[PDB]
């Protein structure tokens, strides 16, 4: 009865600690990577006026596109998951509120 | 150094792929356990309406949920900021070609 409810509470609290560790890692990596991508943009913008470089630059930019598109999809899916969880939490807060009466 | 800078980005993005998958898992798992915990409270509240012990645990979960909601909101706002910066970079990179 009380013991087993306490146990799911502990598991949920464990999951939050892992969520936060992963979130701290994701934010750090995203933060560092957008800075590096911003610097690479300036580098490309510079070399694209000089030597052009045929494909060596045109394909190298294309590669970065594909990685950016990849990340575009991951952030969209992360947004969509968090928004769903937010919605379900507000449903849960309402449901829990009304349990008592 | 263009190759060094590019390869270093491919490094980050690999780690970034990995922390995205784990965070998705954590969010899925957490939402599922919270739903299952609600269904547990709902079941045990039908037997004993007035139980003070069970209501105290509900009240603690309400405090937990309110803190989680404010936290999820901060995740949303930060992810939106990153995604806007990313979409500015994509736009920028687009007009190189």
Q: What is the resolution of this structure in A?
A: 2.0
In Å, what is the CA distance from A96 to each residue of B29, B45, B59, B63?
19, 11, 9, 11
Residue with tokens 């590019």: B6
Residue with tokens 């030597």: A51
Say which residues have a Cβ less than 8 Å from residue B76's Cβ, sequence separation at least 6. Answer: A79, A82, A83, A86
- Which CATH number applies to B1-97? 1.20.1480.30
8 Å CB contact between A43 and B2? yes
Q: How was this structure determined?
A: X-ray
Name which of B27, B55, B94 is nearest A85 (Cβ-Cβ): B27
**Domain boundaries along the sequence of chain A:** 1-101
Name which of A23, A61, A97 is nearest B97 (Cβ-Cβ): A61
| CB pairs A-B closer than 8 Å | 189
Please state the CATH superfamily assignment of the domain spanning residues A1-101 in this structure: Designed four-helix bundle protein (1.20.1480.30)
A27 vs chain B: nearest CA distance in angstroms? 8
B67 vs chain A: nearest CA distance in angstroms? 11
Overall residue count recorded for chain B in this entry: 97
């Amino acid at each position: 009865m009380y013991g087993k409810l306490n146990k799911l509470v502990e598991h949920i609290k464990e999951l939050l600690q892992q969520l936060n560790k992963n979130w701290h890692r994701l934010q750090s990596n995203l933060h560092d990577m957008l800075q590096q991508m911003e610097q690479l943009f300036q580098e490309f913008q510079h070399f694209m006026q000089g030597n052009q470089d045929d494909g060596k630059l045109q394909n190298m930019i294309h590669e970065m596109q594909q990685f950016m598109n990849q990340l575009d999809n991951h952030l969209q899916s992360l947004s969509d998951t968090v928004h769903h969880f937010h919605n379900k939490l507000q449903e849960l807060m309402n449901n829990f509120h009304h349990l008592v009466h």
